[PDB]
Symmetry: D3
Subunit: 291 residues, 6 copies
Amino acid sequence: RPIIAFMSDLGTTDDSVAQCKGLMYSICPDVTVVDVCHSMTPWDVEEGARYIVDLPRFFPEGTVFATTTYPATGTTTRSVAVRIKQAAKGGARGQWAGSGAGFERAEGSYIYIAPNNGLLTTVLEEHGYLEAYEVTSPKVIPEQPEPTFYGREMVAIPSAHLAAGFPLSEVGRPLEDHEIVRFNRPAVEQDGEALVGVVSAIDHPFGNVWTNIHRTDLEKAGIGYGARLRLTLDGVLPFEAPLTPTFADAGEIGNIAIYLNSRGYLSIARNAASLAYPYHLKEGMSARVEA
Amino acid sequence: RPIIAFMSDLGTTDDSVAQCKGLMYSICPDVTVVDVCHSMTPWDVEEGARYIVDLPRFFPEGTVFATTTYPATGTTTRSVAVRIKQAAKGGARGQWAGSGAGFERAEGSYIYIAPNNGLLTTVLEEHGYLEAYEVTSPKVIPEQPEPTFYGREMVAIPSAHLAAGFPLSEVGRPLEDHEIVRFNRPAVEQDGEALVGVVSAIDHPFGNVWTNIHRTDLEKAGIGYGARLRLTLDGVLPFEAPLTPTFADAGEIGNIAIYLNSRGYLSIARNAASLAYPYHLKEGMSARVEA
Amino acid sequence: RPIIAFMSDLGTTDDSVAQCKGLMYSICPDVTVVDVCHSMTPWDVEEGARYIVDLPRFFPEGTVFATTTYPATGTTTRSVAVRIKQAAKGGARGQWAGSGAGFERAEGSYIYIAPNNGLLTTVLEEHGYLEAYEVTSPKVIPEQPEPTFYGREMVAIPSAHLAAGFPLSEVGRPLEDHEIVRFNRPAVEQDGEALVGVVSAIDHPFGNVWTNIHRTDLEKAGIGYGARLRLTLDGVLPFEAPLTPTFADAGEIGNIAIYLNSRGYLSIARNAASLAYPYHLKEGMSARVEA
Amino acid sequence: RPIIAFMSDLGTTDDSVAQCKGLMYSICPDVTVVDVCHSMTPWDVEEGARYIVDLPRFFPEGTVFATTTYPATGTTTRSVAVRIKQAAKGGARGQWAGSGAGFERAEGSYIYIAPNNGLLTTVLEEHGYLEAYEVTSPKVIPEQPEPTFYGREMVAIPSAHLAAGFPLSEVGRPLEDHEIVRFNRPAVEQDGEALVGVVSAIDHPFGNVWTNIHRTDLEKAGIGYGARLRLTLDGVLPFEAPLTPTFADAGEIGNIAIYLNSRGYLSIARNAASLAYPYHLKEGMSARVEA
Amino acid sequence: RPIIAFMSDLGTTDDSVAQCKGLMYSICPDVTVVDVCHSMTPWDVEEGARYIVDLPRFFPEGTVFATTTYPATGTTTRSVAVRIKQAAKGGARGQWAGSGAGFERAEGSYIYIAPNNGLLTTVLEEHGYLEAYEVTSPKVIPEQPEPTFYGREMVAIPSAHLAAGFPLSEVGRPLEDHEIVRFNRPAVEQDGEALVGVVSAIDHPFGNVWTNIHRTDLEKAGIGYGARLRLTLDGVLPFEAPLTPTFADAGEIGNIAIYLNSRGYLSIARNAASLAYPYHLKEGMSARVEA
Amino acid sequence: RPIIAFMSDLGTTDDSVAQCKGLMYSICPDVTVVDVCHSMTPWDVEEGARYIVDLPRFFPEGTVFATTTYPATGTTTRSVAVRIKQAAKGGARGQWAGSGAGFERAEGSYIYIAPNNGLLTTVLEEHGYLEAYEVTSPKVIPEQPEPTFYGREMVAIPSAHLAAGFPLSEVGRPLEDHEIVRFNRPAVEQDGEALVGVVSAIDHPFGNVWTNIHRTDLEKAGIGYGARLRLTLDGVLPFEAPLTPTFADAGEIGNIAIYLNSRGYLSIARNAASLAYPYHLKEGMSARVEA
Ligand SMILES: Nc1ncnc2c1ncn2[C@@H]1O[C@H](CSCC[C@H](N)C(=O)O)[C@@H](O)[C@H]1O
Ligand SMILES: Nc1ncnc2c1ncn2[C@@H]1O[C@H](CSCC[C@H](N)C(=O)O)[C@@H](O)[C@H]1O
Ligand SMILES: Nc1ncnc2c1ncn2[C@@H]1O[C@H](CSCC[C@H](N)C(=O)O)[C@@H](O)[C@H]1O
Ligand SMILES: Nc1ncnc2c1ncn2[C@@H]1O[C@H](CSCC[C@H](N)C(=O)O)[C@@H](O)[C@H]1O
Ligand SMILES: Nc1ncnc2c1ncn2[C@@H]1O[C@H](CSCC[C@H](N)C(=O)O)[C@@H](O)[C@H]1O
Ligand SMILES: Nc1ncnc2c1ncn2[C@@H]1O[C@H](CSCC[C@H](N)C(=O)O)[C@@H](O)[C@H]1O
Ligand SMILES: [Cl-]
Ligand SMILES: [Cl-]
Ligand SMILES: [Cl-]
Ligand SMILES: [Cl-]
Ligand SMILES: [Cl-]
Ligand SMILES: [Cl-]
């Protein structure tokens, strides 16, 4: 019945993740552990945030997201555990996921547990929350935690207790909003009639280029499907294509497609060929779009 | 009880596969999702085929194979769902898998669902099929599918409905045989008394070299275990060894072994050393064998 | 209820692991298969040992560890199956895992099954064993095993029978202690007042450097937290820092931390930066430590 | 007084070039040997052509160009020695080289000696010739030439005899025009109003991109300095800039400059930054230019 | 008789340097052109400066140094031509070069010609100068210079006229000191009793590490040969060795040597092994030394 | 008239070689300095030897070879200066170099000067010598030599004095034969009727493979041009071809050629393609040949 969806910076080249899973099954025998991914750049909370923010609408209600990169491991820091508000629609269009008209998710139906280091910034921003607690109770964490392995001690373990029905409000004291650490998200800037952002990610394993320019930013400027766009990357690359729903709309294999990715963001690719890999395009390069 | 075995080109560097799994558990609460792999070269249907064709005899009857690389995502194309006929023996010798005499599998016991883009070419060729349907019903796919994520929309989602016991014949109309896209498989050619093929794969993580020269191709030349072979790769690097059951039969560590791999194909390796990696041997290089 | 924790050298780039899993579910329908890792350097039994030795205390009692690199596959060799004695405490300090005071594990609670090639060397050394058997019974292995895939035939399959409650003592004859293959572990030497060992692993994905110098080796040399250490790597590159519990104790980002890792061994890192990657530090480099 | 300007595919990692030089000084004691370069891709006659075609106007009259890549070494092939007609103006503008108004060179003032394999194709095309001879006389080549080192035997040695005043007409028989091997040069095509060519070279060590679109091809298309151009590379990567004389005209460091190189061809660069290296741009990529 | 020593950023993979040499021989037939090197990082004036500052004492009086990296090519900028004052002693000890007691060089005996872009900063600092002129006369430069090739037009050509005895004072107007562009050289800082500098260069092809901490800096602190030093690179590498004259003084092959290089600067190496290459040490890393 | 041929481990990435040249022109104004190469692996005397042993027959009588890799720089070691006996024929066939019947060189006509560290081992072995002296006289070396630059101090400088006619016997005391350091050359072994040696070099820039199996080794096995050979590299990659004079005799581009290189040694290549580079073949790999 209960699900823990687990996202960490632990990698998959040793037994580290398996140690966390052993403890999850120990504490909540009937649990199903779903790997989110374990491949994020260590300590890059903005990147980790990207792998967890879009999750809730896909999962059954009552799912617990155990999400961690813990560079402050072994310090007096304690994890935060939050019940989110809106499961939140998503995608290029903003919809429920699933067959038919999709699976509508109730509010207050998902818990995230993470270091209190900004990792949940965009989860809180995009979903809101109903309650948040500091994770301190020796009922849900070790009395003597391993200094270097707080993702296990302070996330995996308590997540399993939560999955098992340990009451959220009993993990430790309520946290005020200002006590929840946030990172600052770079805003999309208007520059004349151009929108100015960045490449937010290279979409592996395809080598598509994702930007932080959202559907809603495009709406502000009236850019809908069909608009001929100039999208300039790294300052010197004035790509030109219409905004289309998908890759194949570019026609011939190799042709430039400018589209909305499954996360709702303006993106650029080649049709059934890699854009980013041959030219070594990178996250953090500038991205400007104009009609 | 139900199992979905999931093979995609999504990778494991973000939450993409986790989103599919979330929907799979949502639709079919009792399901077990088994990762086949998510590492294939995007949009290489021939390679994808290799990862799925050998699967049925290993899995419990009733298993659904959700298999996808979807470069035509967001177009009017629709997936194909097929009930295969013969589970099919396999391996170096052609046998059932498992302990004792192996686990014999009843016919008609497995469903594959895939883009209709040739991905199932070798599944159909080696297993046959009993029935095939176009996947169109809004009961099993989204009414408004995400343009760029058809592996989720048109494979993961309906696969979970099938695992959940949604009648196969209700997914959409029956497809005639000519409506199922196939790729052309390069044939092994006889060239005097040499068999001429190709390196089909580098067997990672070992760096063994796999060819498309099947056991049946060797029997047809009368080549059995013990035959001294000259196996020439890339037209220029030749090798000489007896055909042996396994690596250790080569003797000293590092010695050349020519063998039949666990999928029934002529292969070449060094004994407990890598052959491919030091010499940068690659898929697609010619492979010629002669007694 | 039953759990198989699976560690192999099979990788995750083809369907090899999924084939084993299919058979595991076939044999033991209610089993949960947990991936330990599949990324070990092929045939490196010392490295594989490291990924399995610390597992038992994390898992529910009754867990079966299926652990394999099988370079002698297809030969007359047979696997060994052992019931270990002590679950064994671990970590920087030596404790039970889990919330509160941790979860104590009963003796005799875990089975390992592996090639008899030394892979279990440190498992047996650190946990002891109560019983050990050669795996030969056609009830738990194939009568005609695939020559190249003994990890599946002789580890995965029988592990699933064991998980299903097949009596351990029925897998084949008892093995005497001398019949269980061991590798020799390089000892830490005292050299004057310095301890001399090796880099045992680069801790991915962080680039931390792990040595084979154990807490107890430090204890014997009169070294505890707070001791200023000089640690020399590769007989060239020197570092100096106090022994501290964790990374952040080093102060500024990028500063050297010398610490005890979660496995109980002397290690060195940069605080929230990679030590090993910029300097290309490697497994097998010498490591010398002095107060 | 006498000069040999030496261009080979011999490299500079062994004594090969020094062996040729030793013989040059032996034969013509007062000679000055000038290295052109020795780094060309072996056997690439088109690339070797580029390193020699622009030389004559820079050198004193009477200079001998010894130019060689000799993949047909050790065969019945013999070198060609030609006296060119026009020294030929060059550069972005088409002028004589040197201080003041430049140094005009008399017609018939330079000899090239090379394998008869097409290496001199553009030399003959851009300079014309007055006379051409097969190099066969044992007075200027070895009676027993080294099979693998014809660049030394059939170019370096005879070039030194020529520099020493050995009569050109005495090296062997006159060659007719059809007996002089030519490669085919890919033409620049007009495609609507766009010029379509290729990247002819990456200009090391800067990473500037050179095309085969000549000043005169631009002239015919109505394009002069100041014209805003769109230049597309590899059919994917677009750049836009005015045609300017030099790099600094682009303004800020890193800005795109589109210009005429010192050989007279349309080129593109970043101002005091590398264009080609970060994007891995390559020789042979398509290059399309439009006003 | 006359010598031009030529240092540029032109590389040795095309005919660019040979074009400059052709013109040098054209203008000054009896000249000897000596390659300094052509491998510097383009536009890195600090690096170019390093390859030219130590030259004068090695060369016959009357030598002309033609030294160029010209990113401002094709602009209104003009080269500077300077007669230096002190030829200047050098080396670990500060001496004349040559056999016996060395070759004492007269003052005012060397000319450098370069872009006026800071390239001569350390030449002027270490040698002083007696006169400096802007290079503008059409007698020594082209009336219509190639826009992209000012190293040839504005350095190679005029250098050859100077070698031929064209009067220095006739190249153009005298320049005031403030009109000669300088870069700022990073000072060695005292930090307690440590000297703090940088790695100024990796010494290829050996991989020795050179710092900007000079013999004279070492004298200020009393550090002479025999002093046990701690030299910390990149902030975290506290190397320890005595200051010794040479590599072999470190004893065993591979041992750390801290020494004075042939340019007079504090350096660190391994004895007959590479220090920098295995650990990827780099120019610009911090370098701290203390007794 | 005088020539110095200069082979060092100094590289061409800084002004090091230029400093030596400056001193050479200072000491011997009329000299011509010919670069042999400066690219050898530092401190690899065996490799250095390869670049110098074949030189004499190519150069005018009276030529001085200044040859250095000086890992013992700054120690009490002193260079050796030798007058060699036989200039020595060479090549695939063993002949004089040059046009016509070649240039016969008188005995005693060449001097080498080198560190006394084995660098001249093969020079002495293949040419013999008439006289050898330790280089100690302050007339030909510095009274206070630079500790780290002995190739300049103890080779370049005295070589220029010798070129200038300083009497060889006046450089210091005569050395007895046992005082001249030699390295041990690995012998070609006979192994049944196979000849067993080593890959001595990858022939750059082509990627041909050179062995230490000499023509004389082949004659001793009766192997002449036309013999079908099996040549096995690295113990595992074998090749089959007739021994032919040159590359083109292999026929089609890419075909394997086995030949005698221009230095008289058994070699293997592809015809106008690289053999070594795609397969990463390396110096030091075993090389076995059999008829
Ligand atoms: N160098 C470093 N500096 C700061 N935090 C680090 C670190 N290396 C790892 N961490 C943190 O420590 C945790 C993993 S250490 C635990 C896993 C490890 N493979 C083991 O077996 O012990 C993660 O939360 C990670 O972000
Ligand atoms: N450039 C491209 N051209 C054609 N198909 C592409 C493509 N890039 C991805 N795809 C297809 O689109 C699907 C993945 S898009 C979904 C995964 C992505 N990481 C995300 O989060 O949105 C796969 O079926 C893939 O084969
Ligand atoms: N070159 C080699 N020498 C010795 N053993 C090898 C080997 N390559 C693989 N093996 C062993 O054979 C087993 C894996 S072969 C089975 C997996 C393979 N990808 C397949 O589908 O056939 C492993 O136990 C491995 O260690
Ligand atoms: N693999 C190959 N196929 C065809 N020609 C080749 C070749 N390798 C080298 N050559 C040709 O042979 C000549 C050089 S071989 C002479 C130089 C060599 N380093 C030596 O010392 O022997 C060149 O003209 C080159 O183009
Ligand atoms: N991208 C760039 N931006 C600014 N200056 C550049 C540049 N590329 C080269 N240069 C400058 O231009 C000069 C070389 S261009 C001349 C050589 C070139 N290989 C040719 O044949 O035309 C040098 O002075 C160099 O520093
Ligand atoms: N780490 C090291 N150990 C032993 N010898 C070394 C060495 N590094 C350089 N050498 C030797 O020292 C000489 C070069 S030092 C002189 C060149 C240097 N680029 C400079 O400008 O000072 C060569 O003889 C070389 O072989
Ligand atoms: Cl963690
Ligand atoms: Cl998909
Ligand atoms: Cl296996
Ligand atoms: Cl040649
Ligand atoms: Cl220039
Ligand atoms: Cl030297």
